[PDB]
Amino acid sequence: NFAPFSAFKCYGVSPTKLNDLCFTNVYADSFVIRGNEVSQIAPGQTGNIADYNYKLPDDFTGCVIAWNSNKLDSKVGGNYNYRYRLFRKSNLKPFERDISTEIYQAGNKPCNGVAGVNCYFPLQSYGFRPTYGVGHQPYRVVVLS
Amino acid sequence: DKLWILQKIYEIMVRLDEEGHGEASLMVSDLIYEFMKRD
C-alpha cells in the first residue's frame, strides 16, 4: 500500500524480510510506459523498452511496482509529453540511460542532422489518450534496487 | 531492400499519429522495433 491499485513483484526476498534487512543505498527508478510493456521491467526480458530504454540485469533482486495512470497521464487529443526510444545501434547495458536525440541513420545516406527518408528522430511519443485500451494506457512504474 | 519497407512502415506510424490513430501507431512502432532487431 505504498501507492494505489498497485501491482508489485519482488525478485529477491519478500517485502517483510526487507524490513529486517539493511543496505548502504536504495535506488528508486521511475518512469511511464504502456501497460503491455510493464512485463519488460523484469530480469531477462527483451523488447523495445528493455532493449532501448530501461534494462534490469539478469540477476536483479529488487522490486518492480506498476499502476495504471490513465486518469493522470492520458489527455484528450493526446499527451505528447511521454516518449520512448524506438531506434538504437546497440542494446542498453543494465541500468544504462540514453537521453541522446541524434537522428538515427537507417540507411547509407547521411542525415545531416535532419529527419527524412531512412533518417528517423529516435524518440517516439506514446500520445496517451483516455480511450486507449488498458494494454496501451500509461502505467507509472517504480523500481527499487 | 530492407530500407524501403522500413521507410514505408515508419511512414504509416507517422500518418496514423497525425490522423489521431495513436493506439494503432504504437502497434506499428512495435513492428519497427521487431523488424530492426532482426539481422
Swiss-Prot record, chain A:
Q: How does it assemble?
A: Binds to host ACE2. RBD also interacts with the N-linked glycan on 'Asn-90' of ACE2. Cleavage of S generates a polybasic C-terminal sequence on S1 that binds to host Neuropilin-1 (NRP1) and Neuropilin-2 (NRP2) receptors. Interacts with host integrin alpha-5/beta-1 (ITGA5:ITGB1) and with ACE2 in complex with integrin alpha-5/beta-1 (ITGA5:ITGB1). May interact via cytoplasmic c-terminus with M protein. May interact (via N-terminus) with host bilirubin and biliverdin, thereby preventing antibody binding to the SARS-CoV-2 spike NTD via an allosteric mechanism.
Q: What is this protein called?
A: Spike protein S1
Residue ranges, annotated region (Disordered):
86-121
Lineage per the UniProt record:
Viruses, Riboviria, Orthornavirae, Pisuviricota, Pisoniviricetes
Question: Impact of mutating A106V?
Answer: Increased resistance to neutralizing antibodies
The stretch of the full-length protein covered here is: 370 to 514 of 1273
Intrachain S-S bonds: C10-C63, C111-C119
Report the outcome of Y84F.
Decreased HLA binding to NF9 epitope. Increased binding affinity to human ACE2
Cite the effect that the entry attributes to Q124N: Reduced host ACE2-binding affinity in vitro
Q: Where is this region: Integrin-binding motif?
A: 34-36
Q: Where is this region: Receptor-binding motif?
A: 68-139
Q: Which consequence is recorded for altering V114A? A: Increased resistance to neutralizing antibodies
Residue ranges of every copy of the BetaCoV S1-CTD domain listed in the record = 1-145
Name the segments for region: Immunodominant HLA epitope recognized by the CD8+: 79-87
* Span list, region Receptor-binding domain (RBD): 1-145
The protein's job, in short, is: Attaches the virion to the cell membrane by interacting with host receptor, initiating the infection. The major receptor is host ACE2. When S2/S2' has been cleaved, binding to the receptor triggers direct fusion at the cell membrane. When S2/S2' has not been cleaved, binding to the receptor results in internalization of the virus by endocytosis using host TFRC and GRM2 and leading to fusion of the virion membrane with the host endosomal membrane. Alternatively, may use NRP1/NRP2 and integrin as entry receptors.
Per the UniProt entry, the effect of G77S is: In strain: Omicron/BA.1, Omicron/BA.2.75, Omicron/XBB.1.5, Omicron/EG.5.1
Effect upon mutating Q124R: In strain: Omicron/BA.1, Omicron/BA.2, Omicron/BA.2.12.1
